[PDB]
Design a protein around this ligand. Structure first.
Ligand SMILES: Nc1ncnc2c1ncn2[C@@H]1O[C@H](COP(=O)(O)OP(=O)(O)O)[C@@H](O)[C@H]1O
Ligand code: BEF
Lengths: 65, 445, 32, 473
């Protein structure tokens, strides 16, 4: 019997690894690993990872000028 | 869902208030028109005869084929309380509402009407020059404000208050701006008739304490009035409402006599193309439209590049689509707008594509897709990109003393539909923030 | 009948796969 | 744009709104829209006069996109420079442009057409006895060419190697050079009697390409672009058959060179005795007065290390004065060193054949002063619907990266990252299923792979043949 407030993140392996890399740079991102498709993240960092992660993914997609 | 929305509102009205709504024949004539054709046939039969007819006689009129319609018609007729079911002598006699019966008879027979249709001053005016421009501009001004495109004059606070208080055009003071919502895009998609009912229907619900019956006596009476004619002066509540209606581009006032507008008659019943566009594989847009409405709506999810007098050219971009999606517009709505506003040339070639598809293999009937399939897939794929990251709010439960307790609490959350994830091996589960309090209370008990 | 059978086989040889018939986005992603 | 009130939505178009101009009463018939600022051309393919403009536009405007209904062209200096070459003056372009345009032509567009459509046809470069003379039809040009800082009826010599410099210099100056060959009156060069056999069937687009070249009657140097497999090889055969003079062919492969000779022999009436193949295998050259040498750029562009067997052939090629050069896959000539061949070898006319006229760098535009302008280009979908080329169900399969490999993808560097996500196990499964499914369908499958290591691993895992650089011919 113990509750822990947080944000449950559901995603795919590829997104999971990206979150880990961001967690490696910023420790507070990930609070605990649940499974291969679920992660616990800090609520405050949600608004920042979502916008920054898109910039990182922008490299994989070619936007013509 | 034009009549359904209006009919649905009339059902929630109490029967005691519905009786008052039938006093004015003007409203009765409109409420008579909204019913299905079969329902109207029976109503016209019962109105002029002062007798009671068993329901079995009504069934005899309908053929076996139309039996299903007879169920919807009777259910809809009974829901409005226009048809009063009276059971006596072992028979379920059927009768019409006396007030509705009397009101209909007076109008059809030319009897006293209590000025339900108004009066005439014989001071006709020019409608195309002023009325059409005024209401079209006034109805366009609210749309430009809705679309967000700049425009000097802004709508009055009366309608603005209604918009914010309504789900349409969600606003935030902290943001300091107004943006369209999912239903807002649907509103822009609806035809002018339904596009007017939605704002009016919201107005009916917004008003509080102006009597509910008086508001309906005015709106329905407005449709009866004929454009380009004068009407003397009306209820006290209707006076402020008349000014309020002037803000919606429904009634034009010179400053004693009020003149209805084209939109007033358009409310009762219905009534190359402008707005038609071509979509290429290069995500380019070429709209054969010369009108701010088509241009304004296209800019929601299109990055315009140039324009001509007769046509407007643009290019779809991820940024423009992302901006539209951020406002809550679903890709299904976007494709519906494109499909239902496709150029005839696209339809003809698309029909040929279907004919060619059926010509080669007529066994299967593939859907008629006007625009190339790749555009739909890419637009849907862009939607998937936004939905990639999924996050919830809640609490994680762990450190359970016994598996039975872990299963009990986790099973309880599943029963109430607040469980988001669980793992038997780790004896941990996650529940939504909404169900946190319920789970905690169950844990204590 | 053989020529009709050959024509049917010829048509089958030219028919496109199933995944081309319908847009397979909603279905589960390809894999093992 | 005079006395035109801006619209409430005019801000969406940043200096691009073209509503200030008026539309002609005959818009329903005229199929053309002209952009007064960027030169973009929107074409109606479902309205009258569409076919009459589908050919004129391609000559004066390059095609950006040509989908089913609405084609998109654009007028540029290079596009105009290509049209002015084939007997076209400013008046013809303006007259047709106005007659087909729904909107009036702006003054800026008129100015642009006038400037670039008057340069062609005042300076000629001629070759005699392996000596390059810049011959001009008027004496006034001497005060220009001889006085130019770069250069150096009147005719003066010019360095053979410096051709690449003067030709680019001629682009900067008002008058560019045109390479026209009057093969009818050229008797000094030995002629070759070859013709297309009756079995040949010239497709309609092939005839149109030739008409744009021989319209005036004098062969023009330039580039012809046709879809892959459209028959670019046959295009060179037709030019050789009508010119009837010694010709040399450069092709960018060893197998392809073997393809050209077999195609030459099959399509035209060239006797085998007059044909010589200059490849790595055999190095014997024709001894007849006129013949054909089919080689590759590496055999003509190499300068440092040439074999003793290949050195005599190079002297054989250089000693004689060729009358025509066919550069197959001309998309490789503007390279750093391949451009040297155009200045060294002697030829009175030059032709370029390539299915694709685009490349990563900006040197593609240099082709104008290297071999000449682009004469003709052919659509892809137009031939697809006419049965000339097959229809394709293009597809793009998205294979998700496996979790294990993707972990190394983040830490690994760019050079090694490529190999990591190219050999994910999921791709192996998809390829095997597709191969089996398509094989039972009676379809011949081709699997491309730029990575040799992956090619061998895939080939050995599936027991199928593989080909790459080291494999012998
Ligand atoms: N007129 C024609 N008649 C018959 N076959 C032709 C004709 N034109 C081209 N082909 C065929 O097209 C194929 C490709 O020719 P090729 O010159 O290699 O094309 P490209 O160089 O444009 O890729 C060959 O099989 C050739 O025989
Ligand atoms: F394959 Be070809 F030479 F375009």
């Amino acid at each position: 019997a113990r509750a822990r407030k947080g944000a449950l993140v559901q995603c795919d392996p590829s997104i999971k690894a990206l979150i880990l890399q961001i967690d490696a740079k910023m420790s507070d991102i990930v609070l605990e690993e649940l499974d291969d498709t679920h992660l616990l993240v800090n609520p405050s960092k949600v608004e920042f990872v979502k916008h920054e992660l898109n910039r990182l993914l922008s490299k994989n997609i070619y936007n013509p000028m | 869902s034009l009549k359904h929305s209006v009919t649905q509102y009339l059902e929630e009205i109490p029967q005691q208030v519905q009786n008052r709504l039938y006093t004015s024949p003007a409203t009765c004539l409109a409420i008579y028109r909204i019913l299905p054709p079969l329902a109207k046939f029976f109503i016209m039969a019962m109105v002029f005869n002062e007798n009671e007819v068993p329901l079995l006689d009504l069934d005899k009129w309908v053929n076996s084929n139309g039996k299903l319609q007879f169920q919807n018609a009777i259910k809809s007729m009974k829901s409005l309380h226009l048809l009063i079911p009276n059971k006596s002598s072992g028979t379920l006699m059927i009768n019409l509402n006396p007030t509705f019966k009397i009101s209909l008879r007076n109008a059809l027979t030319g009897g006293e009407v209590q000025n339900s249709f108004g009066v005439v001053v014989e001071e006709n005016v020019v409608s195309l020059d002023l009325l059409d421009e005024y209401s079209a501009n006034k109805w366009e001004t609210i749309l430009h404000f809705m679309v967000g495109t700049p425009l000097a004059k802004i709508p009055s606070e009366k309608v603005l208050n209604l918009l914010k208080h309504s789900k349409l055009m969600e606003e935030v003071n902290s943001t300091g701006e107004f943006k369209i919502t999912n239903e807002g895009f649907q509103f822009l998609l609806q035809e002018i008739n339904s596009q007017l009912w939605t704002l009016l229907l919201q107005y009916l619900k917004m008003i509080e304490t102006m009597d509910l019956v008086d508001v309906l006596h005015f709106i329905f009476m407005l449709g009866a009035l004929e454009v380009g004619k004068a009407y003397k002066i009306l209820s006290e509540t209707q006076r402020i409402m008349l000014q309020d209606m002037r803000d919606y581009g429904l009634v034009f006032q010179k400053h004693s006599i009020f003149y209805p507008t084209k939109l007033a008659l358009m409310l009762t019943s219905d009534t190359i193309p402008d707005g038609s566009l071509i979509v290429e594989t290069n995500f380019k847009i070429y709209s054969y439209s010369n009108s701010p409405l088509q241009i304004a709506v296209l800019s929601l999810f299109v990055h315009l590049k140039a324009r001509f007098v007769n046509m407007v050219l643009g290019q779809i971009t991820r940024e423009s689509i992302r901006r539209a999606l951020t406002n809550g517009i679903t890709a299904d709505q976007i494709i519906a707008y494109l499909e239902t506003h496709a150029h005839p040339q696209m339809r003809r070639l698309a029909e040929e594509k279907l004919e060619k598809k059926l010509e080669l293999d007529p066994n299967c009937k593939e859907p008629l897709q006007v625009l190339p399939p790749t555009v739909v897939d890419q637009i849907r794929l862009w939607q998937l990109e936004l939905d990639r990251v999924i996050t919830y709010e809640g609490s994680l439960y762990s450190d359970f003393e016994t598996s039975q307790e872990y299963n009990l609490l986790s099973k309880y959350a599943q029963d109430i539909g607040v469980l988001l994830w669980k793992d038997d091996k780790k004896k941990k589960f996650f529940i939504s923030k909404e169900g946190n309090s319920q789970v905690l209370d169950f844990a204590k008990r | 009948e053989l020529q009709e059978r050959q024509a049917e086989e010829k048509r089958k040889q030219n028919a496109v796969p199933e995944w081309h018939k319908q847009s397979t986005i909603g279905k589960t992603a390809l894999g093992r | 744009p005079a006395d035109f009130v801006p619209d409430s939505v005019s801000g969406m178009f940043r200096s691009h709104d073209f509503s200030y101009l008026r539309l002609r009463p005959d818009h329903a018939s005229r199929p053309l829209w002209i952009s007064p600022s960027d030169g973009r051309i929107i074409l109606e393919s479902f309205s009258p006069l569409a076919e009459q403009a589908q050919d004129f536009l391609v000559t004066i405007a390059e095609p950006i996109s040509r989908p089913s209904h609405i084609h998109e062209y654009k007028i540029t200096a290079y596009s105009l420079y290509a049209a002015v070459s084939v007997g076209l003056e400013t008046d013809d372009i303006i007259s047709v442009l106005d007659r087909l345009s729904k909107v009036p032509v702006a003054e800026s567009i008129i100015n642009f057409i006038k400037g670039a459509t008057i340069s062609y046809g005042k300076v000629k470069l001629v070759i005699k006895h392996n000596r390059y003379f810049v011959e001009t039809t008027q004496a006034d040009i001497l005060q220009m060419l001889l006085n130019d800082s770069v250069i150096g009826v009147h005719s003066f010599e010019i360095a053979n190697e410096s051709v690449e410099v003067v030709k680019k210099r001629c682009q900067e100056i008002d008058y560019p050079v045109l390479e026209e060959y009057d093969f009818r009156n050229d008797h000094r060069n030995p002629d070759l009697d070859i013709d297309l056999k009756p079995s040949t069937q010239i497709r309609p687009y092939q005839e149109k390409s030739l008409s744009k070249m021989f319209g005036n009657g004098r062969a023009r140097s330039g580039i012809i672009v046709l879809p892959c497999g459209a028959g670019k090889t046959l295009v060179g055969i037709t030019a050789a058959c009508t010119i009837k003079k010694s010709v040399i062919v450069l092709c960018t492969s060893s197998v392809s060179v073997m393809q050209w000779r077999q195609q030459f022999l099959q399509w035209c009436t060239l006797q085998p005795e007059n044909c010589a193949v200059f490849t790595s295998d055999n190095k014997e050259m024709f001894q007849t007065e006129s013949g054909l040498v089919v080689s590759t750029y590496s055999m003509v562009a190499n300068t440092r290390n040439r074999s003793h067997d290949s050195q005599k052939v190079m002297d054989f090629l250089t000693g004689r004065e060729w009358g025509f050069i066919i550069l197959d896959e001309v998309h490789v000539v503007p390279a750093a060193m391949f451009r040297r061949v155009v200045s060294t070898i002697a030829a009175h006319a030059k032709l370029g054949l390539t299915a694709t006229l685009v490349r990563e760098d900006d040197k593609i535009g240099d082709l104008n002063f290297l071999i000449g302008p682009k004469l003709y280009e052919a659509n892809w979908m137009e031939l697809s619907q006419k049965g000339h080329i097959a229809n394709v169900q293009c597809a793009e399969v998205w294979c998700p990266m496996t979790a294990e490999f993707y972990q190394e993808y983040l830490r690994e560097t760019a050079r090694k990252r490529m190999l990591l996500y190219i050999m994910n196990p999921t791709k192996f499964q998809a390829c095997q299923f597709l191969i089996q499914y398509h094989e039972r369908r009676g379809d011949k499958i081709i699997v491309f792979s730029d990575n040799v290591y992956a090619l061998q691993e895939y080939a050995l895992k599936m027991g199928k043949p593989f080909i790459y650089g080291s494999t012998p011919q």
